């Protein structure tokens, strides 16, 4: 099914000691330069990404103008609003300085840690 | 008596460091992926989803496979020293003219090989700790 | 074929394409505004 | 002659010494940590792969719903 | 007319496709179930 | 008189250990390829069996 790693493990302890605070996946506190540094990196990459989506919008509309067809054919126009809003939401840093998918990746990390903890626990229980 | 008992600790700490560096790399990559979400390219819900899936499964399976290699090399060390013990006594037999000093230093050299083999032997098995994960990623993709 | 300006005008004139495009431009402008505010506040 | 390594060979001796016992190909036991090791690895990979099959199953059903055929094209019935 | 729901109804209406899909789902669920039992027993 | 008589022994042992690492790797790989039976992708009847 699924597993949260045991409370006493040092792997997540040091994970949070490095990254500081991640919302909803870890409660420990450490050196928080990581958090706001990643937050400012997220804001910067958001600005450059906005520039890049504007450029991709120009090239996409130029390509569509070469066809002369309404509603566009290179993109499904019903998926674009939900795609854009979801991607923008996942790039919003919270007060702790992390985006939603950074939390997603940290959750994947701790889940892999828990799987490794299962394997090691089975080995040691047999031992 | 000293290097062998600690060498697994060295290699496992370095492997865990490689894992942590991978965590940092994927953490830095995550905003790039969520920026890839907002591409106007196609209608897929992942965009450039090869990167996301590949890096995610890599970091997810890195620790379990490191433990896999750890226990595998623990099992491998004993069979390795047993290979060495089975082969050494006969592989050195004719070397043991070989009279006088030649006989003395010969003993030295055979010992200089025995533990030498030992020092390589376990070490190679322990590179197996770093051998399973990446090669596994070659299989899935 | 017609000029690119005619195609652009036809794309803009369609109501539903117009509303999606204006909405997405609003999201983009809000994103860059938030980014600018953050990089200015952090310094 | 048939492929059958001799009885006194140590290649299979050390192979079974390492891997414990495999049913029908090897006789003998050693450090059977590898046994439960591969068992739990098999269980974990079975669960994760099962999740993967359900995932690819809804992908295939969504793909075939767009076309209108039965159980997709590459996937047969 | 034709949509995803109608496609789902058409696939479920065919007896042979329905039974093979149900059988494969049964094998999948028993696989994950035995995996869960083995994992729980390991810990 | 010393290194030459024993060097081939070392090389063969290291090669056989490369083989042992390879067989362990194949043993670990077996569940993945047995898992690939489900997917009918490709012209092959084994799924992803290359």
Backbone dihedral angles phi then psi of residue A40, each to the nearest 5 degrees: -70, -35
- Residues of chain D with C-beta less than 8 angstroms from the C-beta of F20: 18
Cα atoms in the Cβ-side hemisphere of radius 13 Å centred on D77: 16
Asked if A123 and D37 come within 8 Å (Cβ–Cβ), the reply is yes
Whole-number Å distance between alpha carbons of A48 and A63: 23
Asked if D49 and F27 come within 8 Å (Cβ–Cβ), the reply is no
Closest listed residue to residue B22, CA positions, set B56, B52, B46: B56
Contacts 24+ apart (CB under 8 A), A33-39: A35/A96, A35/A97, A35/A98, A36/A97, A36/C42, A37/A97, A38/A93, A38/A97, A38/A98, A38/A102, A38/B27, A39/A93, A39/A96, A39/A97, A39/A98, A39/C38, A39/C42
Closest listed residue to residue B131, CA positions, set B47, B72, B53: B72
- Residues of chain A with C-beta less than 8 angstroms from the C-beta of D40: 118-119, 122-123
* Closest residue in chain B to residue F7, using alpha carbons only: B113
What are the Cα distances from residue F26, in Å, to A77, B139, D25?
47, 11, 16
What is the three-class DSSP state of E39? helix
Whole-number Å distance between alpha carbons of D47 and E32: 5
Contact yes or no, E with C (3+ CB pairs under 8 Å): no
Q: State both tokens at B79.
A: 């069979």
Asked if D33 and B71 come within 8 Å (Cβ–Cβ), the reply is yes
CA distance D65 to chain B (A): 16
End-to-end CA distance of chain A: 24
Whole-number Å distance between alpha carbons of F13 and B90: 14
- The residue count of chain B comes to 141
Burial class (CB in 10 A: 0-12, 13-18, 19+), F27: middle
Q: Which chains neighbour A (Cβ–Cβ under 8 Å, 3 or more pairs)?
A: B, C, D, E
The answer to whether A92 contacts chain D (CB < 8 Å) is no
Pure H helices in chain B: 3-37, 49-91, 101-127, 132-140
């Amino acid at each position: 099914l699924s597993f949260a790693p045991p409370a006493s493990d040092l792997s997540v302890v040091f994970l949070g000691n490095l990254f500081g605070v991640v919302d909803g996946v870890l409660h420990g506190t450490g050196s928080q330069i990581m958090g706001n540094m990643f937050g400012v990196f997220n804001s910067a990459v958001l600005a450059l990404g906005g520039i890049i989506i504007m450029y991709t919008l120009m090239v996409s509309t130029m390509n569509t103008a070469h066809e002369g067809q309404m509603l566009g054919q290179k993109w499904s126009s019903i998926w674009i609003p939900l795609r854009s809003t979801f991607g923008l939401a996942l790039l919003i840093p919270k007060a702790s300085g992390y985006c939603m998918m950074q939390v997603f990746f940290m959750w994947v990390i701790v889940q892999g840690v828990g799987a490794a903890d299962k394997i090691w626990e089975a080995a040691l229980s047999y031992l | 008596a000293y290097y062998i008992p600690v060498l697994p600790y060295m290699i496992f700490t370095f492997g865990s460091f490689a894992w942590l560096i991978a965590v940092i790399e994927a953490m830095v990559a995550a905003p790039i992926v969520a920026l890839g979400v907002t591409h106007p390219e196609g209608n897929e819900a992942f965009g450039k989803g090869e990167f996301a899936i590949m890096i995610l499964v890599n970091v997810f399976l890195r620790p379990s496979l490191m433990i896999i290699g750890y226990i595998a090399a623990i099992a491998l060390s004993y069979v390795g020293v047993w290979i060495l013990n089975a082969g050494f006594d006969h592989a050195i037999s004719y070397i043991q003219g070989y009279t006088g000093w030649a006989g003395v230093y010969a003993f030295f050299f055979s010992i200089l090989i025995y533990t030498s083999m030992y020092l390589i032997i376990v070490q190679k098995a322990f590179t197996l700790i770093a051998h399973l994960p990446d090669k596994v990623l070659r299989w899935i993709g | 074929m017609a000029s690119k300006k005619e195609n652009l005008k036809s794309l803009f004139s369609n109501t539903r394409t117009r509303v999606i495009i204006i909405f997405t431009a609003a999201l983009l402008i809000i994103a860059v505004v938030i980014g600018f505010f953050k990089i200015r506040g952090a310094t």
